């Protein structure tokens, strides 16, 4: 509960999982 959650704007959250079903769905 430092700066974590102080600036919370994440629509592309978990990029190393957004990859995991970026083109896998394709």
């Amino acid at each position, epitope marked *: 509960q430092d*700066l974590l959650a102080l600036d919370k704007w994440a629509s592309l959250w978990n990029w190393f999982d957004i990859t995991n079903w970026l*083109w896998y769905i*394709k």
Partner: antibody
Amino acid sequence: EVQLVESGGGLVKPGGSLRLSCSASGFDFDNAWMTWVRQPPGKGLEWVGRITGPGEGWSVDYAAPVEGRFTISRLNSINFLYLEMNNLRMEDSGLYFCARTGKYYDFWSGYPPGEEYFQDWGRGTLVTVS
Amino acid sequence: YELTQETGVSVALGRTVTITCRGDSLRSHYASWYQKKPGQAPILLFYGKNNRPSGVPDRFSGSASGNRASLTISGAQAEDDAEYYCSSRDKSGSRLSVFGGGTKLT
């Protein structure tokens, strides 16, 4: 103009520890995530580690020799990338570089996690163990 | 290395010639290639397998030959020749973007 002034480290016994800092100003530190790499003097660049994006996990992934040795942290309030390097061996040395990693991906040739690139680096900071 | 490389090549001051760098993981992922004159800040010659970042030398060319990432340098400038480096993921699916060392353009 993304100045990356990294300044820290010096002489130390084979066993020890030290604390390198990598400032940064002129871009968005708050989400773009950064990497460290090591270039031992009689060697080329070798990859060390990289903080993950705030909101992209905020975690770190060490390297094959470095795993269990180093630790990476970022204080985004002051735009500072700290690297604690502890439990030192003798091969640990060189002009340790801090650069701003990027996220690159595309369809067609897509494959997780894709690839990243090191665009704006720092000047350098020598560290040598004895 | 896992991203195995070449020790180096030579120059002719006006040549359009290629330099290469092997490593299977690149057949699954993209490619990264850099320029690092000693004593200076390294630069990025190619951002991604098929793309190059701004400010790169215009003479520079070539993209990739598979897991043997190869690219061509044209109009060989003596000061520019320096040395160049290679990188990509070490295992397919991993996040460890190993730096696979480099080549003495010489």
